[PDB]
């Protein structure tokens, strides 16, 4: 046999004649092997191992992930955690990343720790709150559905959120404040694309597609201080069904009825478990047409993302929703389940263009036609930044979402957008403020410095006015 390795023979000395049978290579070096004897073959020296037919001379051989080769020192990014292979094993950080609820479609929920479950309801439910156990607590987010036990062109969602004594709620594609909260500084709204991004603090945010998807985002700050339909955000996935009465249920339909807000509305019923929900039941063809349309999740344009994110959960939702949903003129109970997966893909760095003219078109020409001349600045995007600068929000903001879909404006640099006028405009024409010189927002209607009365030099700015009011002396 060849020089780079030495021949072996079975010794009759010992039964443990581990040879060609227990051929140590890279991925089986640390593992344990059986052996009834040798094969009396020719095996590598004691100081090296086989690899891809090459007896790689050192124990520095690669450190695989996703079935791909990594020489030592190479790095990968998983979440907000870089990770590197030192000797033969990956060496990852321990920075806990930010978690995200979701309402994938009409009746499904994805917890912080990651748990899809089926809960169709028609009452009002607690989605997440900090008022849990022995916590003092700060906020209380609710979700109210109507006509949504059966996913269809019915099921408009309403969302109320209670924070800092505030009550800002939303339905019919709009946001409506009902009680302004005290610390208005942290309140912040960003209407970018198909979405209402909505910031509420250093560690809280909401993302809404104006129809059905609710994605509240939280940070390390809480870390087992919340509860609701989204769970407790502790890393453990098996305890996300701990109900209001402090026990785990095996059935999700009994979990959600624990979190209803009115005790005297209806408990949603145990449906008998079937793979064919409503209309796919007796019609096996429509059960096949829905699948093959939902097998787009495993398609050529998604192959990059199918490696990072399993499509099987989002495929279960695509079949459930549009079986029950009877779509006539608004193919939305299908196109929203796929926009959800594409949104997740984009957050992991995989931008995706799945949308054509015969599949979920999403035109954007209306925001250019209302002007007498078709100025042509609004264009649909695969995924564009949600956090940008405008006449209203000129400063850079905490950006919980890297990019978002939808109709995005674009005009050359040195021109800033406003939302009151669909078109863009130079910066100086914005109603921007700079009182006494310093850079801040576009004259936010905020009382600056209530803290120190002596140093209370209050300065507001409506649109442009270089104004400063006086602080009413307490004496």
């Amino acid at each position: 046999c060849r020089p780079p390795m030495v021949k072996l023979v079975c010794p009759a000395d010992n039964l443990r004649a581990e040879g060609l049978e227990c051929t140590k290579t890279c991925q089986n070096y640390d593992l344990e092997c059986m052996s009834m004897g040798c094969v009396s073959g020719c095996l590598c020296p004691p100081g090296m191992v086989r690899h891809e037919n090459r007896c790689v001379a050192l124990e520095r051989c690669p450190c695989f992930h996703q079935g791909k080769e990594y020489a030592p020192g190479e790095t990968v990014k998983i979440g907000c955690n870089t990770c590197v292979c030192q000797d033969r094993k990956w060496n990852c950080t321990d920075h806990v990343c930010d978690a995200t609820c979701s309402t994938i479609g009409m009746a499904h929920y994805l917890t912080f720790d990651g748990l899809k479950y089926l809960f169709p309801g028609e009452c009002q439910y607690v989605l997440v709150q900090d008022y849990c156990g022995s916590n003092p607590g700060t906020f209380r987010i609710l979700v109210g559905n109507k006509g949504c036990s059966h996913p269809s062109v019915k099921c408009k969602k309403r969302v109320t959120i209670l924070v800092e004594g505030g009550e800002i709620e939303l339905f019919d594609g709009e946001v409506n404040v009902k009680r302004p909260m005290k610390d208005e500084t942290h309140f912040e709204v960003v209407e970018s694309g198909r979405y209402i991004i909505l910031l509420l603090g250093k560690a809280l945010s909401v993302v809404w597609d104006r129809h059905l998807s609710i994605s509240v985002v939280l940070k390390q700050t809480y870390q087992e201080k919340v509860c609701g339909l989204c769970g407790n955000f502790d890393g453990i996935q098996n305890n996300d069904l701990t109900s209001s009465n402090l026990q785990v249920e095996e059935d999700p339909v009994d979990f959600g009825n624990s979190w209803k807000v009115s005790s005297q509305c209806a408990d949603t019923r145990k449906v008998p478990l079937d793979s064919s929900p409503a209309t796919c039941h007796n019609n096996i063809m429509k059960q096949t047409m829905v699948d093959s349309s939902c097998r787009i999740l495993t398609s050529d344009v998604f192959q990059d993302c199918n490696k990072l994110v399993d499509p099987e959960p989002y495929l279960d939702v695509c079949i459930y929703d549009t079986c029950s949903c009877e779509s006539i003129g608004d193919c939305a109970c299908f196109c929203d389940t796929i926009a959800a997966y594409a949104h997740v893909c984009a957050q992991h760095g995989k931008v995706v263009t799945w949308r054509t003219a015969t599949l979920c078109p999403q035109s954007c020409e209306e925001r250019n036609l209302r002007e007498n001349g078709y100025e042509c600045e609004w264009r649909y995007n695969s995924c564009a930044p949600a956090c940008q600068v405008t006449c209203q929000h000129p400063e850079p903001l905490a950006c919980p979402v890297q990019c978002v879909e939808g109709c995005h404006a674009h005009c050359p640099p040195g021109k800033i957008l406003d939302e009151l006028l669909q078109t863009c405009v130079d910066p100086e024409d914005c109603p921007v403020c700079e009182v006494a010189g310093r850079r801040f927002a576009s004259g936010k209607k905020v009382t600056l410095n209530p803290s120190d009365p002596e140093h209370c030099q209050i300065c507001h700015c409506d649109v442009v006015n270089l104004t400063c009011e006086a602080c009413q002396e307490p004496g």
Binding site: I284, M285, Q287, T288
Partner: protein, 323 residues
Amino acid sequence: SSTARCSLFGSDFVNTFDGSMYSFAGYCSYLLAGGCQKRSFSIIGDFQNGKRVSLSVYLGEFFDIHLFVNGTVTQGDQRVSMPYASKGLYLETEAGYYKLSGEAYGFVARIDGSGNFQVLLSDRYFNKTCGLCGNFNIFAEDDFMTQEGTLTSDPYDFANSWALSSGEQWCERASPPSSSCNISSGEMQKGLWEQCQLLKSTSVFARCHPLVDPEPFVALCEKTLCECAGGLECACPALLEYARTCAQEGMVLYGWTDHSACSPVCPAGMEYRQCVSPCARTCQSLHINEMCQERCVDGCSCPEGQLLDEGLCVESTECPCVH
């Protein structure tokens, strides 16, 4: 070419897409063709005991047809009339022979009067299908790719691999039947060996020899001239398959049934033409020419006049009307 041809002729015999002959006395249902990576359809052949019963076509998991030799057809369990056109499949009768066309899916299946099956299949499946009719490369030495993905030499452990059971069928393995020909022989074989030999000698068959060899065709007939009795028509199934092969390879051959003394069976009134057109002007047809420019087809059709009206031949004068 652009198409292929599998044939399940005679008793137990098979001819693959690439020219491999072998006997198979199956006892249950077996896969004939279909994709081996993703199945949009699957042509299936059901036997009762050695002898064949039906041809079946399943479309993924939603639709199923079962045409028999007796004539009955059924979508699932419910027996339906014929013709029939559902779901991109036209179950019709061309030239006395039943046809199941799936040109959208890329296949044509027909059974003749004697019960012999046939499957024509597009070039969009070259090296993209495997089954009891093998794959559709050009090589014949590798038609036995088992369902495990391995080669084979025994035709049975190959074809037994493709058995497809059901809740009602639950089928067992098949074995070579006993040979009662080694004992039953004599003056019969010496005289009956002739009919297999004429495939070589007679001028009408003596020009497909560059297209296809009769060597595997004479081999399969001689083992079936030994069990039958009282005639010389036992050799003509092999002889008919040779004709149908040479036609598909691009040489139609005429008048070979005039002296062969084996007429293929067809119903009353019609006799076995060779190379008749499929769009035979019938009694209630529109006179719409230069449209049915399809390939010429073998089969039986009415006399020169004597148009067709609901499965019989009748002179044009007695054409009825419809209301």
